[PDB]
Ligand binder design. Sequence first.
Ligand SMILES: C[As](C)(=O)[O-]
Ligand SMILES: C[As](C)(=O)[O-]
Ligand SMILES: [Zn+2]
Ligand SMILES: [Zn+2]
Lengths: 234, 237
Amino acid sequence: MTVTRPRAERGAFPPGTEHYGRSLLGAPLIWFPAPAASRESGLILAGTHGDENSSVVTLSCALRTLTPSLRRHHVVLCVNPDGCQLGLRANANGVDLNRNFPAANWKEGETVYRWNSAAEERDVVLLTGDKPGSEPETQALCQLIHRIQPAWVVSFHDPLACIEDPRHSELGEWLAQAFELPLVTYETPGSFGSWCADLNLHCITAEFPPISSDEASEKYLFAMANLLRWHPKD
Amino acid sequence: MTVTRPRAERGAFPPGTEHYGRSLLGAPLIWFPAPAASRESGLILAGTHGDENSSVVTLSCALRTLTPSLRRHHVVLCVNPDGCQLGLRANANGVDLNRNFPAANWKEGETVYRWNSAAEERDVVLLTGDKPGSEPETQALCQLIHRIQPAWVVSFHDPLACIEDPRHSELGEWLAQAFELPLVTSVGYETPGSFGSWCADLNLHCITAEFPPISSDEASEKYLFAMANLLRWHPKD
Ligand SMILES: C[As](C)(=O)[O-]
Ligand SMILES: C[As](C)(=O)[O-]
Ligand SMILES: [Zn+2]
Ligand SMILES: [Zn+2]
């Protein structure tokens, strides 16, 4: 009946969850199949990086806020659940998963990244994997996308405050309006966006700003929930 | 000879990780035993609630920063690894793990938390377990703390911005000063089956350190000093 479930009921997910694999350490890889599924259904995902959690919690809350039958798009809350309980960027093998996809530009070697926003120089080192798509997490996500074939992917990260949509599109600016973030128009080797580029899978990286889970779950709750509900207003 | 590992290599964990069990969904329960544990060795805890992320990244950063030799205290980054992955406060059973401890004051049925700091009341319903200490995450931690017998426990949460020391002791006043958070004895509401409630019945000193609302990006900046010093904390002498 209502657009949203009463707050008193939002402690738990609506029943429906499936598993799409297992993490390196044995935690399930989880995804939430859209109830209103169709060929227009996109894939919304988060937590590729274990320390990027404002977007994980906000999407979880949105999932638990929007009445099920209104959700059009498939959701993965956390791509990297090991890195996530270890509060770190990489998975459990030290691999920057977003340098591990079996894209055409997957170079093997080392990657580096910034300590925080106040970090200035990308010095903190990680690896890229042994072979392309080497990690369990990478394959599972890739296999999940090939099976369901989303019309588009929106990949949440942080803390750059913007929407990155190389297509310049209706979604990428719906996203700009509703999250009040600037829009901006993939070469990052072995990243998710390069791998989608190869397939002409539309991929928008949704870069949260540095924000608490406590603020985001209020500030960004509605924009997120509307994202699960989105359709080109035509 | 440095107090901290070089920023360039803080991407991995220093050796000596162990498992003290399995989450409901099958993830490992992971802990980081203190290098040379002594009678002084205490316990530093995080991620009891899976959406209270900013301390689990902060503690993971501190653990990955401070030079390993200098660590005095045991560490659990994530009590509820199914919680953290699901961006949820409860575990995979809709149980509030901090109402699930086999303390004497454990009560069956429902518990309610605050949606967020914006919400005017506590009305979001969770479960307390179908029995005292029902949940695997809860049992595993309870047995860990029996095996190791810590000097004390600091458990980090979100987002009440304060240090809750029921004893008002030194560590409590250290924590208050080091993290620039007020020192208080309680969250002015009742929490049956809470971890601290279980600790009090064992006469184990538990301190809950509540972060304020703060991103993992600024907490990895603003509080890394304090967290790192907590891993090597000793009384005044
Ligand atoms: C710096 As990136 C493309 O790994 O979010
Ligand atoms: C409700 As509490 C003391 O676990 O923040
Ligand atoms: Zn990132
Ligand atoms: Zn709490």
